[PDB]
């Protein structure tokens, strides 16, 4: 079962969404500085690195203002998380290109 | 070049014969044997068909096309109905509805009505494998759309370029700011939108700069 699909399952549980609603993806390159909380972006680490970003959406995600995302550096997994109604990023995973800083991937089962 | 507007064909056909372009084409042709590729062939160049190359007044540089079924159709930030607008486009609609009097969310994400008016919606990469974001990155499209940007830089005056995100910003970092308007801010993606995009007022600024430049403004509402 793909990561994508596990994050969907967790998000549909956490937020009471439709289990089978089709999710789409938006994929955007951006420097990490423009994308990650201050405390996670540091020189020699993420700062000034281009990330590949995936942001998931559907009708009910739109309606709830929930935007799950997965972040990559090259092909290295950098983050799994969601943005919420208030625009707080919440993370189930975050890795700074050196080591994990946050690991709660176990919630994805 | 099939499905490629003739007014554009006229001025850009110098590329079709360069080795990178011939390779690019062969790549995408091979790709279409093994994979569904978006946009389907007739829509790879929708941006050359919605308006004449001389009617172009506003340029918005995008990245790659949306990579699911019935999404991309040849215009950056645009999806075909009934597919929901992407989160970037939802934020563009938000800024609009504060920026532009009586702008209503049009309930869809087809930006064809902007295109027809001479808003050029130009992705940097013009194809993608279905379900694989970035899969046609760095195979020639970037040079092709760089050329489109250069042709525009050199063959027009007073365009308004909207550069959202550092990527589009590097792509536009050679536009002559003496002859062209360049407005820059964060990418409207939910991930970066609060770093400049909300409150950029680019749609009204463009309209003021177009009016100022002796040209007719964009009807941003001519979606609905
Ligand atoms: Mg948080
Ligand atoms: Mg891309």
Residue A90 marked ligand-binding: no
Which of these, A67, A64, A74, A71, lies nearest to A101 by C-alpha position? Answer: A71
A30 chain-B contacts, CB cut-off 8 A: 165-167, 187, 189, 191-192
Rounded-to-integer distance, Cα B33 and Cα A102, Å? 42
Rounded-to-integer distance, Cα B80 and Cα B73, Å? 7
Side by side, the strands of the sheet bearing B181-185 are: B119-123, B58-62, B160-164, B181-185
Q: For residue B4, how many other CB atoms are within 10 A of its CB?
A: 16
Give the method of determination.
Answer: X-ray
Number of compact structural domains in chain A: 1
Bridge partner residues of B162 (DSSP): B60, B183
Resolution in angstrom units: 2.4
Record: fold of B1-224:
Uracil-DNA Glycosylase, subunit E (3.40.470)
Rounded-to-integer distance, Cα B61 and Cα B54, Å? 18
Which of these, A55, A86, A4, A32, lies nearest to B90 by C-alpha position? Answer: A55
H or E, element range at A100: strand A100-103
> Which residue among A30, A58, A83 sits closest to B166, beta carbon to beta carbon?
A30
Question: In chain A, whose CA is at the least distance from the CA of B68?
Answer: A24
For every residue of B19-50, DSSP letters joined together read: HHHHHHHHHHHHHHHHS-EES-GGGTTGGGTS
Distance, first Cα to last Cα, chain B: 33
A80 chain-B contacts, CB cut-off 8 A: none
* B138-146 contacts, C-beta under 8 A, 24 or more apart: B139/B23, B139/B24, B139/B27, B139/B28, B140/B20, B140/B21, B140/B23, B140/B24, B140/B27, B141/B24, B143/B20, B143/B21, B144/B15, B144/B21, B144/B24, B145/B171, B146/B171
Rounded-to-integer distance, Cα A52 and Cα A38, Å? 18
Residues A86, A1: contact at Cβ < 8 Å?
no
For strands B58-62 and B119-123, give the pairing: parallel
Q: B 61-120 residues with CB below 8 A of A? A: 63-64, 66-68, 71, 83-84, 86-88, 90
Measured CA to CA in angstroms, residue B78 lies from B60, B66, B111, B144, B216 at distances of 12, 9, 5, 20, 23
Whether B84 and A24 lie within 8 Å, measured CB to CB: yes
Q: Where are the domains of chain B?
A: 1-224
Bridge partner residues of B129 (DSSP): B37, B132
Residue A1 marked ligand-binding: no
For every residue of B170-206, DSSP letters joined together read: HHTTTS-TTTSEEEEE---STTTGGGTTTT--HHHHH
Residues B212, A105: contact at Cβ < 8 Å?
no
Q: Report DSSP state, residue B132.
A: B
Residue B64 annotated among the catalytic residues of the structure: yes
H or E, element range at B163: strand B160-164
The angle at the Cα of B69, spanning B119 to B34, to the nearest 5 degrees, equals 110
Q: For residue A78, how many other CB atoms are within 10 A of its CB?
A: 23
Is A34 near chain B, with CB under 8 Å? yes
| CATH number of residue A100's parent domain | 3.10.450.250
Which of these, A55, A54, A37, lies nearest to A46 by C-alpha position? Answer: A37
A28 chain-B contacts, CB cut-off 8 A: 63, 88, 165, 187, 189, 191-192
The angle at the Cα of A72, spanning B68 to A27, to the nearest 5 degrees, equals 30
Which of these, A4, A25, A70, lies nearest to B65 by C-alpha position? Answer: A25
- Domain range for A16 is 1-109
Q: Which tokens sit at B108?
A: 């869809």
Whether A24 and B68 lie within 8 Å, measured CB to CB: yes
User: Shortest Cα distance from B38 to chain A (angstroms)?
Assistant: 14
């Amino acid at each position: 079962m793909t990561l994508e699909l596990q994050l969907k399952h967790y998000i549909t549980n956490l937020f009471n969404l439709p289990k089978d609603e089709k999710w789409e993806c938006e994929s955007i390159e951006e420097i990490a500085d423009d994308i990650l909380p201050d405390q996670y972006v540091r020189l020699g680490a993420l700062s000034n690195k281009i990330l590949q970003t995936y942001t998931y959406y559907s009708d009910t995600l739109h309606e709830s203002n929930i935007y799950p995302f997965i972040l990559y550096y090259q092909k290295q997994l950098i983050a799994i998380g969601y943005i919420d109604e208030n625009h707080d990023m919440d993370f189930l995973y975050l890795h700074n290109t050196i080591m994990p800083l946050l690991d709660q991937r176990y919630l994805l089962t | 070049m099939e499905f490629f507007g003739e007014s554009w064909k006229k001025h850009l056909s110098g590329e079709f014969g360069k080795p990178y372009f011939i390779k690019l084409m062969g790549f995408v042709a091979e790709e279409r044997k093994h994979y569904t590729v978006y946009p389907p062939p007739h829509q790879v160049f929708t941006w050359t068909q919605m308006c004449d190359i001389k009617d172009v007044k506003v340029v918005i540089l995008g990245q790659d096309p949306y990579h699911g079924p019935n999404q991309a159709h040849g215009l950056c930030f645009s999806v075909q109905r009934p597919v929901p607008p992407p989160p970037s486009l939802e934020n563009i609609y938000k800024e609009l509805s504060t920026d532009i009097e009586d702008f209503v969310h049009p309930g869809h994400g087809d930006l064809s009505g902007w295109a027809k008016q001479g808003v050029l919606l130009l992705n940097a990469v013009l194809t993608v494998r279905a379900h694989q974001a970035n899969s046609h990155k760095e195979r020639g499209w970037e040079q092709f759309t760089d050329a489109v940007v250069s042709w525009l830089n050199q063959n027009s005056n007073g365009l308004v370029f909207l550069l959202w995100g550092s990527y589009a910003q590097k792509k536009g970092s050679a536009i002559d700011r003496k002859r062209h308007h360049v407005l820059q801010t964060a990418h409207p993606s939910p991930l970066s939108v609060y770093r400049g995009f909300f409150g950029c007022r680019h749609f009204s600024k463009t309209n003021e700069l177009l009016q100022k430049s002796g040209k007719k403004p964009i009807d941003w509402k001519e979606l609905l």
